[PDB]
Every structure is written in structure tokens, then in C-alpha cells.
Amino acid sequence: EMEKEFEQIDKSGSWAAIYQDIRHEASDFPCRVAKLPKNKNRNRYRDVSPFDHSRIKLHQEDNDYINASLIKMEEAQRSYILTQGPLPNTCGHFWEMVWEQKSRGVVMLNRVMEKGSLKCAQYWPQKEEKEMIFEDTNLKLTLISEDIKSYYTVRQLELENLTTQETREILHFHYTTWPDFGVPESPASFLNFLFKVRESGSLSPEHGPVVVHSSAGIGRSGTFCLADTCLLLMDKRKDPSSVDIKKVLLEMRKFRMGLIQTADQLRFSYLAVIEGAKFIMGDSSVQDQWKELSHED
Ligand SMILES: O=P(O)(O)Oc1ccc(Cc2ccc(OP(=O)(O)O)cc2)cc1
Ligand SMILES: [Mg+2]
């Protein structure tokens, strides 16, 4: 049971060892397509690639590769597409993926610039009057409105398939204060953000998989997805004790390598799930408390 176990691990100071054991048992599948010479420029990081079995294929006969993986959680009945922050040359592919997979929301857990370095391209419009056209994939993207809060911003975007003139509203959830290889300010800030995404319907089964990304699409992204899935699992059963956090992470790791990058992010996942369990188990008022504690204004 996660809380009891959280106590034992904490008291022993064994987060490093527990996290290392997870890395040790994690799946290892080939990424042949990711490593093809022609795809060199489609990967942000040499050491972070999508397994061939779970990679998202772009619908085109030219080059269908994009550094993105489909994390299909069978038991939880939820899927996510984890991807790297798009590069200057892969922005069109990114939106093509969003279009083809029928995603309703895009969760960004990083900033364009971190530690003096460009960790992701500016793939969405920053101003209403300056829309973006991706010539290669024939898509148009316009900023419709944005709600800026202290540590996150929600944007309403309009994605248009110029070939068919069909349009869709895409919701962009941008967490701007989560340091790479770091953790959110508090479980409250994280849960407040997660519940905003949930609240929007973006994580609902009637839509394609929500797209979740960070710079590499594995650390902060893995943390986000792990907490959400564990919460959904205990929600289905209304039984927090049926959830084995580590087992869940290993299951996700069958779909994309390196999910959750540090022992502290793992520890933070436990905290988020234990705190979130309060809402799942009947205390709906806790949601407004996270909102207050997050100081989003
Ligand atoms: O670049 P460094 O900071 O020097 O060390 C890293 C090396 C590789 C990664 C990605 C990565 C890490 C682990 C991984 O899977 P696993 O070995 O835990 O199974 C898959 C990708 C992240 C950090
Ligand atoms: Mg203006």
C-alpha cells in the first residue's frame, strides 16, 4: 500500500535504490527507425528515442517518423502520446500528429528556454494576429485566447487542415515552473494543474490521446502521466490500495524509455497520488484547497 510503503522508503532513505531497481527491470525494445540516418535531424536527444513497437507513425509515404510514443494503458483505459519538445523542423510533423491522432489537448511541461538553452521550438502562436502556417504538412494554427496564471497558462488554439478546411479547437496547458530534472512546487500545484487538464475533457476517451511533452518527453512527462493513471486506476475501483505505483510505471515504460528521470520525481509521484486520493475517495472540497495553495492568481 503506497502510503505505508512511502513511509518505509522515506525512513530508510532508499528512494535512490528503489528508483534504480525500476530502471533495472525496465523494458528494452528496439528503436531502429529512430536511429535511421535520415531521421538524425528529427531527434532532439541522441539518447531518447521511441521504441519501434509504440511509435506514432505520421500518415505520409515520404517519412512517417516523429519522436513520439503511444503509452496505451490497457487496465486504466487511457492513452497518452508522449513526445519531445518539437524542433524547428518538426513543428509541422507535431501538428500533423495532433491532427491525425485526433488529440483535443496538448500538455507542455517545460519552457522554450531553460538553463540558457533552447529546449523546445516556439511551435504555437504567441499572438492572435500572427497565425502560423506549416507549409510542409499544410496546417494552419491560430491563437484564439489565453488564460495566464502564476505558474501555468491555458491557451485556446484553432488547428486547420488547409487541405480540407476542417477546423478543430486544441487546448494547450502550459506548466511554466517545472524545472527539468526537477519537481513541481508542491503536490497541490501539480494536482491543481492536472485537474484543470481533466476538467477540460482533453483526457476523455471520446477524443484521441492527449499529447504530453517536455523537452525530452520522458521525465516531467512520465511524472505527469504516472500520477494521472494511478489516480484513474483507484477511481475505477474506488480502492486506493489496489494501485501499485511502481508496477504502473514499469507498465508505462514498456511503451517509452526513461519515464520519470530522477528518484525525487518518483517520490513526488507518490506524494501527488496520495494527496489526489483524497478527492477520488469523496472529499471533493480538497480541489478548491489545492487551487488556494497553488496561488495561481
Ligand atoms: O545524459 P545524462 O544526464 O548524462 O544521463 C542521461 C542519459 C540518458 C537519458 C535518457 C534516458 C535515460 C534512461 C533511460 O532508460 P533506462 O536506462 O532507465 O531504462 C532511457 C533514456 C537521460 C539522462
Ligand atoms: Mg495583442
PDB file of C-alpha atoms and ligand atoms in Angstrom:
ATOM      1  CA  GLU A   1       0.000   0.000   0.000  1.00  0.00           C
ATOM      2  CA  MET A   2       1.618   3.217  -1.250  1.00  0.00           C
ATOM      3  CA  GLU A   3       1.317   5.387   1.882  1.00  0.00           C
ATOM      4  CA  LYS A   4       2.716   2.735   4.238  1.00  0.00           C
ATOM      5  CA  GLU A   5       5.425   1.981   1.705  1.00  0.00           C
ATOM      6  CA  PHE A   6       6.113   5.693   1.176  1.00  0.00           C
ATOM      7  CA  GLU A   7       6.823   5.862   4.918  1.00  0.00           C
ATOM      8  CA  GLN A   8       9.181   2.867   4.938  1.00  0.00           C
ATOM      9  CA  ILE A   9      11.184   4.139   1.907  1.00  0.00           C
ATOM     10  CA  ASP A  10      11.415   7.659   3.328  1.00  0.00           C
ATOM     11  CA  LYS A  11      12.533   6.454   6.758  1.00  0.00           C
ATOM     12  CA  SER A  12      15.154   4.185   5.153  1.00  0.00           C
ATOM     13  CA  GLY A  13      16.364   6.872   2.731  1.00  0.00           C
ATOM     14  CA  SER A  14      16.009   4.350  -0.095  1.00  0.00           C
ATOM     15  CA  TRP A  15      14.477   6.409  -2.931  1.00  0.00           C
ATOM     16  CA  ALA A  16      17.717   6.138  -4.893  1.00  0.00           C
ATOM     17  CA  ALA A  17      17.827   2.339  -4.629  1.00  0.00           C
ATOM     18  CA  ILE A  18      14.057   1.883  -5.254  1.00  0.00           C
ATOM     19  CA  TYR A  19      14.274   4.153  -8.326  1.00  0.00           C
ATOM     20  CA  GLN A  20      17.380   2.295  -9.563  1.00  0.00           C
ATOM     21  CA  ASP A  21      15.613  -1.043  -9.220  1.00  0.00           C
ATOM     22  CA  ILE A  22      12.893   0.321 -11.516  1.00  0.00           C
ATOM     23  CA  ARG A  23      15.475   1.358 -14.097  1.00  0.00           C
ATOM     24  CA  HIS A  24      16.985  -2.120 -13.831  1.00  0.00           C
ATOM     25  CA  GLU A  25      13.735  -4.010 -14.573  1.00  0.00           C
ATOM     26  CA  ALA A  26      12.524  -1.584 -17.269  1.00  0.00           C
ATOM     27  CA  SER A  27      11.792  -2.899 -20.779  1.00  0.00           C
ATOM     28  CA  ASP A  28      14.367  -2.639 -23.567  1.00  0.00           C
ATOM     29  CA  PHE A  29      12.935  -2.696 -27.102  1.00  0.00           C
ATOM     30  CA  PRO A  30      14.491  -1.636 -30.415  1.00  0.00           C
ATOM     31  CA  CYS A  31      14.325   1.871 -31.836  1.00  0.00           C
ATOM     32  CA  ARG A  32      15.610   1.011 -35.333  1.00  0.00           C
ATOM     33  CA  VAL A  33      13.515   3.626 -37.122  1.00  0.00           C
ATOM     34  CA  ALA A  34      14.549   6.370 -34.660  1.00  0.00           C
ATOM     35  CA  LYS A  35      18.190   5.585 -35.392  1.00  0.00           C
ATOM     36  CA  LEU A  36      17.929   5.633 -39.200  1.00  0.00           C
ATOM     37  CA  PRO A  37      20.410   8.174 -40.667  1.00  0.00           C
ATOM     38  CA  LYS A  38      17.606  10.069 -42.396  1.00  0.00           C
ATOM     39  CA  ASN A  39      15.987  10.724 -39.011  1.00  0.00           C
ATOM     40  CA  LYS A  40      19.023  12.167 -37.250  1.00  0.00           C
ATOM     41  CA  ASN A  41      17.602  15.675 -37.514  1.00  0.00           C
ATOM     42  CA  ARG A  42      14.197  14.628 -36.138  1.00  0.00           C
ATOM     43  CA  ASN A  43      15.593  13.728 -32.717  1.00  0.00           C
ATOM     44  CA  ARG A  44      16.308  16.368 -30.079  1.00  0.00           C
ATOM     45  CA  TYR A  45      18.366  13.991 -27.926  1.00  0.00           C
ATOM     46  CA  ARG A  46      20.606  11.191 -29.115  1.00  0.00           C
ATOM     47  CA  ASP A  47      19.681   9.102 -26.030  1.00  0.00           C
ATOM     48  CA  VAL A  48      15.895   9.498 -26.037  1.00  0.00           C
ATOM     49  CA  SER A  49      14.110   7.623 -28.785  1.00  0.00           C
ATOM     50  CA  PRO A  50      10.726   5.992 -29.336  1.00  0.00           C
ATOM     51  CA  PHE A  51      10.574   2.165 -29.404  1.00  0.00           C
ATOM     52  CA  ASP A  52       9.547   0.914 -32.822  1.00  0.00           C
ATOM     53  CA  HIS A  53       6.579  -1.019 -31.431  1.00  0.00           C
ATOM     54  CA  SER A  54       4.859   2.005 -29.898  1.00  0.00           C
ATOM     55  CA  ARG A  55       5.991   4.909 -32.087  1.00  0.00           C
ATOM     56  CA  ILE A  56       3.418   7.215 -33.661  1.00  0.00           C
ATOM     57  CA  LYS A  57       3.542   6.963 -37.442  1.00  0.00           C
ATOM     58  CA  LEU A  58       2.812  10.098 -39.454  1.00  0.00           C
ATOM     59  CA  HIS A  59       0.328   9.457 -42.302  1.00  0.00           C
ATOM     60  CA  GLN A  60       2.606  10.029 -45.322  1.00  0.00           C
ATOM     61  CA  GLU A  61       4.604   7.882 -47.762  1.00  0.00           C
ATOM     62  CA  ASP A  62       7.720  10.117 -47.610  1.00  0.00           C
ATOM     63  CA  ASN A  63       8.911   9.835 -43.981  1.00  0.00           C
ATOM     64  CA  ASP A  64       6.433   8.843 -41.254  1.00  0.00           C
ATOM     65  CA  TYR A  65       8.835   9.335 -38.324  1.00  0.00           C
ATOM     66  CA  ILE A  66       8.277  11.545 -35.306  1.00  0.00           C
ATOM     67  CA  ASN A  67       9.886  11.163 -31.896  1.00  0.00           C
ATOM     68  CA  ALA A  68       6.602  10.288 -30.149  1.00  0.00           C
ATOM     69  CA  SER A  69       5.272   7.156 -28.379  1.00  0.00           C
ATOM     70  CA  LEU A  70       1.743   5.908 -27.629  1.00  0.00           C
ATOM     71  CA  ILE A  71       1.521   4.935 -23.944  1.00  0.00           C
ATOM     72  CA  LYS A  72      -1.566   2.697 -24.053  1.00  0.00           C
ATOM     73  CA  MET A  73      -2.700   1.884 -20.510  1.00  0.00           C
ATOM     74  CA  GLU A  74      -4.960  -1.138 -21.026  1.00  0.00           C
ATOM     75  CA  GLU A  75      -6.161  -1.557 -17.445  1.00  0.00           C
ATOM     76  CA  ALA A  76      -6.746   2.161 -16.788  1.00  0.00           C
ATOM     77  CA  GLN A  77      -8.397   2.537 -20.227  1.00  0.00           C
ATOM     78  CA  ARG A  78      -6.450   5.715 -21.007  1.00  0.00           C
ATOM     79  CA  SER A  79      -3.807   6.538 -23.593  1.00  0.00           C
ATOM     80  CA  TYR A  80      -1.291   9.378 -23.889  1.00  0.00           C
ATOM     81  CA  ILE A  81       1.118  10.341 -26.615  1.00  0.00           C
ATOM     82  CA  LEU A  82       4.467  11.308 -25.087  1.00  0.00           C
ATOM     83  CA  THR A  83       6.731  13.286 -27.335  1.00  0.00           C
ATOM     84  CA  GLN A  84       9.856  15.513 -27.233  1.00  0.00           C
ATOM     85  CA  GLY A  85       9.581  19.295 -27.500  1.00  0.00           C
ATOM     86  CA  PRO A  86       9.338  19.828 -31.299  1.00  0.00           C
ATOM     87  CA  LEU A  87      12.421  21.046 -33.200  1.00  0.00           C
ATOM     88  CA  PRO A  88      12.407  23.956 -35.691  1.00  0.00           C
ATOM     89  CA  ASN A  89      11.998  21.388 -38.476  1.00  0.00           C
ATOM     90  CA  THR A  90       9.437  19.125 -36.766  1.00  0.00           C
ATOM     91  CA  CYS A  91       6.729  21.634 -35.792  1.00  0.00           C
ATOM     92  CA  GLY A  92       4.624  20.723 -38.817  1.00  0.00           C
ATOM     93  CA  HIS A  93       5.027  16.996 -38.008  1.00  0.00           C
ATOM     94  CA  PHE A  94       3.971  17.718 -34.425  1.00  0.00           C
ATOM     95  CA  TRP A  95       0.718  19.345 -35.505  1.00  0.00           C
ATOM     96  CA  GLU A  96       0.190  16.713 -38.189  1.00  0.00           C
ATOM     97  CA  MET A  97       0.344  14.123 -35.393  1.00  0.00           C
ATOM     98  CA  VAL A  98      -2.107  16.111 -33.295  1.00  0.00           C
ATOM     99  CA  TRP A  99      -4.453  16.221 -36.273  1.00  0.00           C
ATOM    100  CA  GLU A 100      -4.151  12.561 -37.311  1.00  0.00           C
ATOM    101  CA  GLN A 101      -4.435  11.173 -33.771  1.00  0.00           C
ATOM    102  CA  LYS A 102      -7.462  13.398 -33.072  1.00  0.00           C
ATOM    103  CA  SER A 103      -5.961  14.861 -29.865  1.00  0.00           C
ATOM    104  CA  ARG A 104      -8.002  17.511 -28.087  1.00  0.00           C
ATOM    105  CA  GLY A 105      -5.311  18.731 -25.705  1.00  0.00           C
ATOM    106  CA  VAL A 106      -1.552  19.275 -25.607  1.00  0.00           C
ATOM    107  CA  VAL A 107       0.176  19.335 -22.207  1.00  0.00           C
ATOM    108  CA  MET A 108       3.556  21.190 -22.195  1.00  0.00           C
ATOM    109  CA  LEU A 109       5.609  20.744 -19.028  1.00  0.00           C
ATOM    110  CA  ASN A 110       8.661  22.793 -19.997  1.00  0.00           C
ATOM    111  CA  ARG A 111       9.552  26.258 -21.247  1.00  0.00           C
ATOM    112  CA  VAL A 112      11.048  27.133 -24.622  1.00  0.00           C
ATOM    113  CA  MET A 113      14.232  28.281 -22.847  1.00  0.00           C
ATOM    114  CA  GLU A 114      15.631  26.610 -19.734  1.00  0.00           C
ATOM    115  CA  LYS A 115      19.109  26.988 -18.292  1.00  0.00           C
ATOM    116  CA  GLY A 116      20.092  29.399 -21.077  1.00  0.00           C
ATOM    117  CA  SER A 117      19.335  26.739 -23.698  1.00  0.00           C
ATOM    118  CA  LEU A 118      16.513  26.220 -26.228  1.00  0.00           C
ATOM    119  CA  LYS A 119      14.669  23.102 -25.049  1.00  0.00           C
ATOM    120  CA  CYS A 120      11.733  23.326 -27.489  1.00  0.00           C
ATOM    121  CA  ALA A 121      10.751  25.319 -30.584  1.00  0.00           C
ATOM    122  CA  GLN A 122       8.076  28.054 -30.426  1.00  0.00           C
ATOM    123  CA  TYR A 123       5.529  25.721 -32.081  1.00  0.00           C
ATOM    124  CA  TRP A 124       2.342  27.661 -31.334  1.00  0.00           C
ATOM    125  CA  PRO A 125       1.365  31.341 -31.992  1.00  0.00           C
ATOM    126  CA  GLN A 126       2.059  33.848 -29.226  1.00  0.00           C
ATOM    127  CA  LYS A 127      -0.294  36.456 -30.735  1.00  0.00           C
ATOM    128  CA  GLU A 128      -3.791  36.230 -32.244  1.00  0.00           C
ATOM    129  CA  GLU A 129      -2.898  38.372 -35.286  1.00  0.00           C
ATOM    130  CA  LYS A 130       0.253  36.325 -36.068  1.00  0.00           C
ATOM    131  CA  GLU A 131      -1.085  32.867 -37.052  1.00  0.00           C
ATOM    132  CA  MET A 132       1.282  30.054 -38.081  1.00  0.00           C
ATOM    133  CA  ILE A 133       1.259  28.104 -41.355  1.00  0.00           C
ATOM    134  CA  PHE A 134       3.162  24.828 -41.563  1.00  0.00           C
ATOM    135  CA  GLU A 135       3.818  24.603 -45.308  1.00  0.00           C
ATOM    136  CA  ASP A 136       5.180  21.075 -45.205  1.00  0.00           C
ATOM    137  CA  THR A 137       2.101  19.492 -43.535  1.00  0.00           C
ATOM    138  CA  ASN A 138      -0.493  22.001 -44.810  1.00  0.00           C
ATOM    139  CA  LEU A 139      -1.845  23.053 -41.421  1.00  0.00           C
ATOM    140  CA  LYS A 140      -2.733  26.477 -40.021  1.00  0.00           C
ATOM    141  CA  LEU A 141      -2.691  27.287 -36.316  1.00  0.00           C
ATOM    142  CA  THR A 142      -4.196  30.398 -34.683  1.00  0.00           C
ATOM    143  CA  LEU A 143      -4.149  31.586 -31.055  1.00  0.00           C
ATOM    144  CA  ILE A 144      -7.799  32.232 -30.091  1.00  0.00           C
ATOM    145  CA  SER A 145      -7.385  33.240 -26.438  1.00  0.00           C
ATOM    146  CA  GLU A 146      -5.201  32.541 -23.386  1.00  0.00           C
ATOM    147  CA  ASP A 147      -5.667  32.462 -19.603  1.00  0.00           C
ATOM    148  CA  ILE A 148      -2.372  33.195 -17.865  1.00  0.00           C
ATOM    149  CA  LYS A 149      -1.963  32.186 -14.220  1.00  0.00           C
ATOM    150  CA  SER A 150       1.071  32.422 -11.955  1.00  0.00           C
ATOM    151  CA  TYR A 151       2.685  29.114 -12.883  1.00  0.00           C
ATOM    152  CA  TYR A 152       0.743  27.866 -15.888  1.00  0.00           C
ATOM    153  CA  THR A 153      -1.168  29.200 -18.888  1.00  0.00           C
ATOM    154  CA  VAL A 154      -4.087  27.650 -20.759  1.00  0.00           C
ATOM    155  CA  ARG A 155      -4.450  28.512 -24.421  1.00  0.00           C
ATOM    156  CA  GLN A 156      -7.290  28.004 -26.854  1.00  0.00           C
ATOM    157  CA  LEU A 157      -5.933  27.276 -30.332  1.00  0.00           C
ATOM    158  CA  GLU A 158      -7.585  26.599 -33.683  1.00  0.00           C
ATOM    159  CA  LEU A 159      -5.908  23.989 -35.859  1.00  0.00           C
ATOM    160  CA  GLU A 160      -6.934  23.870 -39.518  1.00  0.00           C
ATOM    161  CA  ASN A 161      -6.249  21.198 -42.093  1.00  0.00           C
ATOM    162  CA  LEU A 162      -5.776  23.562 -45.033  1.00  0.00           C
ATOM    163  CA  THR A 163      -6.336  20.646 -47.433  1.00  0.00           C
ATOM    164  CA  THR A 164      -9.902  20.069 -46.196  1.00  0.00           C
ATOM    165  CA  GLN A 165     -10.605  23.425 -44.481  1.00  0.00           C
ATOM    166  CA  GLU A 166     -11.822  21.455 -41.474  1.00  0.00           C
ATOM    167  CA  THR A 167     -11.009  23.076 -38.098  1.00  0.00           C
ATOM    168  CA  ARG A 168     -10.587  21.885 -34.512  1.00  0.00           C
ATOM    169  CA  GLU A 169     -10.174  23.587 -31.171  1.00  0.00           C
ATOM    170  CA  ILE A 170      -6.990  22.474 -29.388  1.00  0.00           C
ATOM    171  CA  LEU A 171      -6.434  23.298 -25.724  1.00  0.00           C
ATOM    172  CA  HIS A 172      -2.806  23.976 -24.684  1.00  0.00           C
ATOM    173  CA  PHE A 173      -1.943  23.512 -20.991  1.00  0.00           C
ATOM    174  CA  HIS A 174       1.433  25.063 -20.264  1.00  0.00           C
ATOM    175  CA  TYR A 175       3.098  24.398 -16.896  1.00  0.00           C
ATOM    176  CA  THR A 176       5.833  27.032 -16.838  1.00  0.00           C
ATOM    177  CA  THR A 177       7.514  26.431 -13.468  1.00  0.00           C
ATOM    178  CA  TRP A 178       8.594  22.784 -13.539  1.00  0.00           C
ATOM    179  CA  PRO A 179      12.434  22.673 -13.773  1.00  0.00           C
ATOM    180  CA  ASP A 180      13.983  19.910 -15.891  1.00  0.00           C
ATOM    181  CA  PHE A 181      15.101  17.036 -13.667  1.00  0.00           C
ATOM    182  CA  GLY A 182      13.046  18.791 -11.009  1.00  0.00           C
ATOM    183  CA  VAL A 183       9.653  18.529  -9.325  1.00  0.00           C
ATOM    184  CA  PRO A 184       6.612  20.888  -9.028  1.00  0.00           C
ATOM    185  CA  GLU A 185       6.456  23.337  -6.080  1.00  0.00           C
ATOM    186  CA  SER A 186       4.030  21.105  -4.237  1.00  0.00           C
ATOM    187  CA  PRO A 187       1.581  18.257  -4.783  1.00  0.00           C
ATOM    188  CA  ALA A 188      -1.130  20.946  -4.614  1.00  0.00           C
ATOM    189  CA  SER A 189       0.292  22.957  -7.525  1.00  0.00           C
ATOM    190  CA  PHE A 190       0.669  19.812  -9.622  1.00  0.00           C
ATOM    191  CA  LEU A 191      -2.819  18.429  -8.825  1.00  0.00           C
ATOM    192  CA  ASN A 192      -4.382  21.823  -9.429  1.00  0.00           C
ATOM    193  CA  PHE A 193      -2.820  21.773 -12.907  1.00  0.00           C
ATOM    194  CA  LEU A 194      -3.716  18.102 -13.572  1.00  0.00           C
ATOM    195  CA  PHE A 195      -7.324  18.705 -12.584  1.00  0.00           C
ATOM    196  CA  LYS A 196      -7.511  21.650 -14.993  1.00  0.00           C
ATOM    197  CA  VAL A 197      -6.491  19.295 -17.818  1.00  0.00           C
ATOM    198  CA  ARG A 198      -9.004  16.657 -16.603  1.00  0.00           C
ATOM    199  CA  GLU A 199     -11.703  19.300 -16.263  1.00  0.00           C
ATOM    200  CA  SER A 200     -11.327  20.306 -19.932  1.00  0.00           C
ATOM    201  CA  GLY A 201     -12.320  16.899 -21.314  1.00  0.00           C
ATOM    202  CA  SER A 202      -8.919  16.582 -23.026  1.00  0.00           C
ATOM    203  CA  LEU A 203      -8.214  13.274 -21.203  1.00  0.00           C
ATOM    204  CA  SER A 204     -11.595  11.805 -22.171  1.00  0.00           C
ATOM    205  CA  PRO A 205     -11.961   8.605 -24.284  1.00  0.00           C
ATOM    206  CA  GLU A 206     -14.153  10.285 -26.939  1.00  0.00           C
ATOM    207  CA  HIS A 207     -11.033  12.191 -28.059  1.00  0.00           C
ATOM    208  CA  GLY A 208      -7.735  10.868 -29.307  1.00  0.00           C
ATOM    209  CA  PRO A 209      -4.832  10.533 -26.809  1.00  0.00           C
ATOM    210  CA  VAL A 210      -3.825  13.801 -25.140  1.00  0.00           C
ATOM    211  CA  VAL A 211      -0.324  14.811 -26.283  1.00  0.00           C
ATOM    212  CA  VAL A 212       2.073  15.247 -23.333  1.00  0.00           C
ATOM    213  CA  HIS A 213       5.567  16.679 -23.797  1.00  0.00           C
ATOM    214  CA  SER A 214       8.522  18.185 -22.034  1.00  0.00           C
ATOM    215  CA  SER A 215      11.927  18.744 -23.651  1.00  0.00           C
ATOM    216  CA  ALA A 216      12.744  15.012 -23.995  1.00  0.00           C
ATOM    217  CA  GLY A 217       9.191  13.795 -23.368  1.00  0.00           C
ATOM    218  CA  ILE A 218      10.137  11.379 -20.575  1.00  0.00           C
ATOM    219  CA  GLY A 219      10.960  12.995 -17.189  1.00  0.00           C
ATOM    220  CA  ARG A 220       8.323  15.542 -16.296  1.00  0.00           C
ATOM    221  CA  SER A 221       6.002  13.841 -18.879  1.00  0.00           C
ATOM    222  CA  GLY A 222       6.431  10.448 -17.209  1.00  0.00           C
ATOM    223  CA  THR A 223       5.667  12.064 -13.829  1.00  0.00           C
ATOM    224  CA  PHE A 224       2.522  13.726 -15.183  1.00  0.00           C
ATOM    225  CA  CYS A 225       1.217  10.502 -16.747  1.00  0.00           C
ATOM    226  CA  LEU A 226       2.078   8.278 -13.791  1.00  0.00           C
ATOM    227  CA  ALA A 227       0.117  10.421 -11.317  1.00  0.00           C
ATOM    228  CA  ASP A 228      -2.869  10.675 -13.650  1.00  0.00           C
ATOM    229  CA  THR A 229      -3.021   6.947 -14.405  1.00  0.00           C
ATOM    230  CA  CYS A 230      -2.653   5.924 -10.724  1.00  0.00           C
ATOM    231  CA  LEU A 231      -5.459   8.298  -9.831  1.00  0.00           C
ATOM    232  CA  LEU A 232      -7.710   6.992 -12.645  1.00  0.00           C
ATOM    233  CA  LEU A 233      -6.980   3.393 -11.577  1.00  0.00           C
ATOM    234  CA  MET A 234      -8.054   3.948  -7.965  1.00  0.00           C
ATOM    235  CA  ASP A 235     -11.076   5.917  -9.275  1.00  0.00           C
ATOM    236  CA  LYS A 236     -12.316   2.928 -11.324  1.00  0.00           C
ATOM    237  CA  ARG A 237     -12.180   0.733  -8.252  1.00  0.00           C
ATOM    238  CA  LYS A 238     -12.740   3.393  -5.557  1.00  0.00           C
ATOM    239  CA  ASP A 239      -9.939   1.417  -3.871  1.00  0.00           C
ATOM    240  CA  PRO A 240      -6.654   3.295  -3.398  1.00  0.00           C
ATOM    241  CA  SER A 241      -4.989   0.136  -2.125  1.00  0.00           C
ATOM    242  CA  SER A 242      -5.363  -1.719  -5.441  1.00  0.00           C
ATOM    243  CA  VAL A 243      -2.775   0.597  -7.022  1.00  0.00           C
ATOM    244  CA  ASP A 244       0.880  -0.460  -7.220  1.00  0.00           C
ATOM    245  CA  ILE A 245       2.657   2.745  -8.314  1.00  0.00           C
ATOM    246  CA  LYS A 246       5.924   1.033  -9.292  1.00  0.00           C
ATOM    247  CA  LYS A 247       4.147  -1.667 -11.309  1.00  0.00           C
ATOM    248  CA  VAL A 248       2.235   1.051 -13.149  1.00  0.00           C
ATOM    249  CA  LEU A 249       5.447   2.918 -14.041  1.00  0.00           C
ATOM    250  CA  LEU A 250       7.050  -0.282 -15.321  1.00  0.00           C
ATOM    251  CA  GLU A 251       3.966  -0.889 -17.463  1.00  0.00           C
ATOM    252  CA  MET A 252       4.283   2.624 -18.970  1.00  0.00           C
ATOM    253  CA  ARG A 253       7.993   2.008 -19.583  1.00  0.00           C
ATOM    254  CA  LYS A 254       7.044  -0.829 -21.939  1.00  0.00           C
ATOM    255  CA  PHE A 255       5.849   1.997 -24.254  1.00  0.00           C
ATOM    256  CA  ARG A 256       8.593   4.667 -23.957  1.00  0.00           C
ATOM    257  CA  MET A 257      12.050   4.617 -22.363  1.00  0.00           C
ATOM    258  CA  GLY A 258      13.106   6.547 -19.258  1.00  0.00           C
ATOM    259  CA  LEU A 259       9.722   7.662 -17.933  1.00  0.00           C
ATOM    260  CA  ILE A 260      10.433   9.628 -14.753  1.00  0.00           C
ATOM    261  CA  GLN A 261      14.056  10.717 -14.715  1.00  0.00           C
ATOM    262  CA  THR A 262      15.026  11.070 -11.045  1.00  0.00           C
ATOM    263  CA  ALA A 263      14.338   9.355  -7.717  1.00  0.00           C
ATOM    264  CA  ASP A 264      12.783  12.587  -6.429  1.00  0.00           C
ATOM    265  CA  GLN A 265      10.284  12.737  -9.334  1.00  0.00           C
ATOM    266  CA  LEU A 266       9.297   9.186  -8.353  1.00  0.00           C
ATOM    267  CA  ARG A 267       8.869  10.326  -4.734  1.00  0.00           C
ATOM    268  CA  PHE A 268       6.886  13.306  -5.927  1.00  0.00           C
ATOM    269  CA  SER A 269       4.602  10.933  -7.892  1.00  0.00           C
ATOM    270  CA  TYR A 270       3.809   9.078  -4.648  1.00  0.00           C
ATOM    271  CA  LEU A 271       3.024  12.372  -2.920  1.00  0.00           C
ATOM    272  CA  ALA A 272       0.743  13.532  -5.743  1.00  0.00           C
ATOM    273  CA  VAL A 273      -1.148  10.239  -5.838  1.00  0.00           C
ATOM    274  CA  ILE A 274      -1.601  10.037  -2.048  1.00  0.00           C
ATOM    275  CA  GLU A 275      -2.859  13.645  -1.945  1.00  0.00           C
ATOM    276  CA  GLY A 276      -5.055  13.171  -5.023  1.00  0.00           C
ATOM    277  CA  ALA A 277      -6.586  10.071  -3.403  1.00  0.00           C
ATOM    278  CA  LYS A 278      -8.468  12.425  -1.060  1.00  0.00           C
ATOM    279  CA  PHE A 279     -10.505  13.793  -3.963  1.00  0.00           C
ATOM    280  CA  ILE A 280     -11.005  10.374  -5.577  1.00  0.00           C
ATOM    281  CA  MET A 281     -12.298   8.968  -2.290  1.00  0.00           C
ATOM    282  CA  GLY A 282     -15.059  11.534  -1.737  1.00  0.00           C
ATOM    283  CA  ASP A 283     -13.563  14.754  -0.454  1.00  0.00           C
ATOM    284  CA  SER A 284     -14.335  16.962  -3.465  1.00  0.00           C
ATOM    285  CA  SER A 285     -13.639  20.173  -1.455  1.00  0.00           C
ATOM    286  CA  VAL A 286      -9.917  19.346  -1.492  1.00  0.00           C
ATOM    287  CA  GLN A 287      -9.832  20.543  -5.134  1.00  0.00           C
ATOM    288  CA  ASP A 288     -10.572  24.145  -4.164  1.00  0.00           C
ATOM    289  CA  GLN A 289      -7.885  23.843  -1.442  1.00  0.00           C
ATOM    290  CA  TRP A 290      -5.214  22.920  -3.997  1.00  0.00           C
ATOM    291  CA  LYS A 291      -6.315  25.924  -6.026  1.00  0.00           C
ATOM    292  CA  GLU A 292      -5.794  28.203  -2.988  1.00  0.00           C
ATOM    293  CA  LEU A 293      -2.477  26.579  -2.003  1.00  0.00           C
ATOM    294  CA  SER A 294      -1.144  26.782  -5.566  1.00  0.00           C
ATOM    295  CA  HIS A 295      -1.531  30.601  -5.564  1.00  0.00           C
ATOM    296  CA  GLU A 296      -2.418  30.677  -9.270  1.00  0.00           C
ATOM    297  CA  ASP A 297      -3.553  34.317  -9.281  1.00  0.00           C
TER     298      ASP A 297
HETATM  299  O1  LIG B   1      22.534  12.454 -20.257  1.00  0.00           O
HETATM  300  P1  LIG B   1      22.850  12.122 -18.847  1.00  0.00           P
HETATM  301  O2  LIG B   1      22.280  13.160 -17.969  1.00  0.00           O
HETATM  302  O3  LIG B   1      24.314  12.104 -18.724  1.00  0.00           O
HETATM  303  O4  LIG B   1      22.300  10.851 -18.368  1.00  0.00           O
HETATM  304  C1  LIG B   1      21.162  10.554 -19.109  1.00  0.00           C
HETATM  305  C2  LIG B   1      21.317   9.638 -20.138  1.00  0.00           C
HETATM  306  C3  LIG B   1      20.207   9.334 -20.894  1.00  0.00           C
HETATM  307  C4  LIG B   1      18.986   9.945 -20.596  1.00  0.00           C
HETATM  308  C5  LIG B   1      17.777   9.455 -21.327  1.00  0.00           C
HETATM  309  C6  LIG B   1      17.389   8.065 -20.829  1.00  0.00           C
HETATM  310  C7  LIG B   1      17.722   7.599 -19.546  1.00  0.00           C
HETATM  311  C8  LIG B   1      17.336   6.337 -19.100  1.00  0.00           C
HETATM  312  C9  LIG B   1      16.600   5.532 -19.972  1.00  0.00           C
HETATM  313  O5  LIG B   1      16.085   4.265 -19.629  1.00  0.00           O
HETATM  314  P2  LIG B   1      16.596   3.485 -18.503  1.00  0.00           P
HETATM  315  O6  LIG B   1      18.012   3.190 -18.628  1.00  0.00           O
HETATM  316  O7  LIG B   1      16.280   3.967 -17.186  1.00  0.00           O
HETATM  317  O8  LIG B   1      15.918   2.235 -18.730  1.00  0.00           O
HETATM  318  C10 LIG B   1      16.275   5.983 -21.247  1.00  0.00           C
HETATM  319  C11 LIG B   1      16.661   7.250 -21.692  1.00  0.00           C
HETATM  320  C12 LIG B   1      18.846  10.870 -19.573  1.00  0.00           C
HETATM  321  C13 LIG B   1      19.955  11.180 -18.811  1.00  0.00           C
HETATM  322 MG    MG B   2      -2.311  41.615 -28.747  1.00  0.00          MG
END
